[PDB]
A paper describes a structure:
As mutational analysis indicated that this novel protein might be involved in host-cell invasion, we named this protein Glycosyl Hydrolase 25 relating to Invasion Protein (GHIP).
Therefore, in order to better understand the function of this novel virulence factor, we elucidated and now report the X-ray structure of GHIP at 1.86 Å resolution. The overall structure of GHIP consists of one domain shaped into a flattened ellipsoid with dimensions of 30 Å × 38 Å × 40 Å. GHIP contains an inner ring of seven parallel β-sheets (β1–7) with a protruding β-strand (β8) at the C-terminal region, and an outer wheel composed of eight α-helices surrounds this inner ring. 14 amino acids, including Asp56, Ser58, Ser84, Tyr121, Tyr123, Glu154, Glu156, Asp157, Tyr185, Tyr209, Asp212, Ser233, Asp243, and Asp245, form a negatively charged groove at the mouth of the GHIP barrel. Analogously, the four corresponding residues in GHIP homologs, including Asp56, Asp154, Glu156, and Asp245, are also strictly conserved. All mutants showed lower hydrolytic activity compared to wild-type GHIP, suggesting that these four residues are located at the active site of this novel peptidoglycan hydrolase enzyme.
Author numbering: 15 to 62, 65 to 243
The structure:
Amino acid sequence: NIAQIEAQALKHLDKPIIDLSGWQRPEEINYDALSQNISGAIVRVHSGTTKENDASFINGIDKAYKSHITELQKRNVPVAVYAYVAGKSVQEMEKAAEVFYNAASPYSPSYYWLDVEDKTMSNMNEGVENFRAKLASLGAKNIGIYVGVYFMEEHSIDTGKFTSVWIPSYGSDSGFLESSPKTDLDYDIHQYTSKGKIAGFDHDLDINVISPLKNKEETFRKLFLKP
């Protein structure tokens, strides 16, 4: 039940939050082990490549998302989703948002995240908003933005209409927390390394933590326990 998931999450609150994509092969993940070593997970569903790869189809659909979502949800881990935002026009942005929503919504994800990291439209702020607005109109309520500080400032990426902000800052990228986002914007969650190692998986993992500037339990509830 819902109280059960919530109790497990309270119990595991100091375990890290991971994000995963098709680059992390489900067959290489011991989900039993991984689920007891994490508090939550954020799974890639879409990337916005004409060449073929192991992590997604040409239409942007991630090759592993059904596995990552189902295997973690069955183990009572709360799971949110993300899309790499890369439309070259409003039309592409709205298309990608629809593809993303339709693929992820069946799983009742705890949050939808826009992963914004390169300029694919002249006014990237407008394109990002196109994506966000479309997702909202399709029914997404929890819509957050992942964006680096320098990118956000360079392209005047407005985070105001999003319901949460997620920011990467790796320092040297050692696998450990070593530098926090260089902004006074009030973000909820910090991607601190791309080279984490967690029991249950042998290879590099993106690891995240709720910002120590927030109340940890309340912010975790916000991001993971309110779909």
